Paper text:
The enterococcal cytolysin is a two-component lanthipeptide secreted by Enterococcus faecalis that functions as a virulence factor. CylA is a subtilisin-like serine protease that is essential for toxin activation. Like many proteases, CylA is translated as a proenzyme that undergoes activation through self-cleavage.
To afford a high-resolution structure, full-length CylA (residues Leu27-Lys412, lacking the N-terminal secretion signal sequence) with an N-terminal polyhistidine tag was expressed in E. coli, refolded from the insoluble fraction and incubated in situ to allow for autoproteolytic processing. Formation of the interface buries ~1270 Å2 of surface area as determined using the Proteins, Interfaces, Structures and Assemblies (PISA) server. The side chain of Glu95 at the −1 position is within hydrogen bonding distance of the side chains of Ser260, His275 and the backbone amide of Gly262. The C-terminal carboxylate of the pro-domain is in close proximity of the hydroxy side chain of the catalytic nucleophile Ser 359.
Residue numbers in the entry: 30 to 95, 103 to 271, 274 to 400, 403 to 412
Write the structure that this text describes.
Amino acid sequence: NISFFIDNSQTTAIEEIESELSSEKVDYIQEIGLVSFKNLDDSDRKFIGKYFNVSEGKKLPDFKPENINILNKDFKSFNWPYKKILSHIDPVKEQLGKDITIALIDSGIDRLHPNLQDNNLRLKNYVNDIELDEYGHGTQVAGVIDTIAPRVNLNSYKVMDGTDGNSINMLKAIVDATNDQVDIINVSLGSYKNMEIDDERFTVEAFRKVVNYARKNNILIVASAGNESRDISTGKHIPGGLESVITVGATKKSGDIADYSNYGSNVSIYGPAGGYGDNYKITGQIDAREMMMTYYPTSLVSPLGKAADFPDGYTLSFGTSLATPEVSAALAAIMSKNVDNSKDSNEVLNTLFENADSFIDKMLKYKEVRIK
């Protein structure tokens, strides 16, 4: 792709280009003055070239993923992350998340999952006409949300088929979710690559603009810190780690930062999201008890879920992608309790941090999400 920022003085140029080129070659985001072109031929480049300098176009990066009651004691080996953050709260009794809408910008969601029939699911697909959650990631994220804040509404923004997506679709989905009036945007996806530095400056600015657009509309964005076991504050991971993003790392069952989790001063908060266990680095084996139970598409087979004797629709997983929705659900719980005593997003955000508990990693001090 080649991407440009378009000034308000140049909007007629984009109109003329959109009229000339096939719609599937042009993605224009009015709200942030961004256009991105793909699959161009020589004729298309020549036409664009009479308004912009094609050689100055920047490349936006690709990104990657980062009745049964999970809270039942049948799953005590695997539901430990939820018990840690909920303590004794019964999310169903408290109707947590009622009338709050979370955008899941992810791989889609299994609309047939038996536990996702009460979330007023709304689906949008940016990539194809396949209505499935093709590889299961968005459904895993939705399961974390639904376990903690079961009464939320879910808007799914499917921005990837398989495991590699184009960031233009993530940017579009953030703006579309804002325009859809969601309350919280969850992004359990990220890019972190030795980008060419000018492409990276461009991409960081594009994300600053979409994040600011959401925040100005009083919407909080929660994003994964990533799973590279890196300090993302030493120079960019995108969007987790950027200004104005609530960036979520993962802790493992011992309470320490998980072996894969990114960390650093631009990671806002952590949530328990499990992992393979301490013996994995030695034997290559996964300790299922160190993993986290969540949903999985009924259209797929989970090997660890089957080995744990789960019904279809459930898996054992890990990742900052699972800690992120714990925070989105925490925010939704704060918001659902403030219907008649309205708090704005700034105050909700500060409440999230006040409610978190501090921990020391095996040696800095960090915050871990708690539901109240």
